[PDB]
Design a protein around this ligand. Structure first.
Ligand SMILES: CCCCCCCCCCO[C@@H]1O[C@H](CO)[C@@H](O[C@H]2O[C@H](CO)[C@@H](O)[C@H](O)[C@H]2O)[C@H](O)[C@H]1O
Ligand SMILES: CCCCCCCCCCO[C@@H]1O[C@H](CO)[C@@H](O[C@H]2O[C@H](CO)[C@@H](O)[C@H](O)[C@H]2O)[C@H](O)[C@H]1O
Lengths: 70, 70, 70, 70
């Protein structure tokens, strides 16, 4: 999230926690949208999936820590 | 917004009204996204600021009318 | 590219052919830009990689056919 | 260029030098395009101006150093 998108670690951890805790998509969307363009880029990257759905998959494959780094 | 981005006056002035009303970033992002590629380009332009933050700064300097025209 | 981004197969497969041929990033950016907002969204998705770098990585993992479909 | 767009200082200085030396727009466009999305964002930010034309103005107003920082 940092390397690819430039999402600060404190914002990214929050986002992933919300994902892992089955939080509202709209929550994830406001946090990510507030980060500015790096967050907009990560929103764009999901495509037509929900961001929650997308990031869930991403943690499933690389684990929390690597998703924060990415 | 018209000259540089191709955002019809009716859309833009609504976007600016939401800015000046201290409305949600996501709302601005959804209106701009809905205009299509001229709105994605304005989103991209804001870089790592929120689009609200960005448009607020633009209105501060040129004032609402010039920002609509731009 | 179709499923997630809405990029017609005729455009996408050309974009991928340019990737695989080691063509200019700007060329990829101009084709994608020309498709309109689905192409801006794919541009945004790549984050801080070049789009060439990004699509190369996608083809490596899903292979050209799935990347067209995606 | 750094604060707003996340353009590394070595790439940004090069770009501004090219601008100040009346270099080709296509040169500026390939460098900026290669930076990835922060460069695409700065390209989007010019709007319908040429990037050279846009950055020329930007240095005129803030001077080289501040344009690198921005
Ligand atoms: C570099 C800055 C990026 C701006 C230019 C490139 C395109 C990126 C612009 C934003 O892309 C996203 O598009 C979607 C539309 O599909 C938009 O929707 C978000 O909010 C919806 C809430 O109603 C939600 O359902 C979507 O999951 C979510 O992606 C998104 O916010 C944009 O960032
Ligand atoms: C966050 C990543 C941004 C991607 C999504 C948001 C929109 C930004 C996509 C790129 O925007 C620019 O659009 C222009 C088209 O007006 C495109 O043209 C560039 O190259 C032309 C060369 O033929 C040149 O004449 C233009 O001056 C120049 O801006 C640009 O490369 C895109 O980055």
């Amino acid at each position: 999230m940092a390397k690819e998108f430039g999402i600060p670690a404190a914002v990214a951890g929050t986002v992933l926690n919300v994902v892992e805790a089955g939080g509202w998509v709209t929550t994830i969307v406001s946090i990510l949208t507030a980060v500015g363009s790096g967050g907009l880029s990560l929103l764009a990257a999901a495509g037509r999936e929900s961001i929650k759905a997308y990031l869930k998959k991403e943690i499933k494959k690389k684990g929390k820590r690597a998703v924060i780094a990415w």
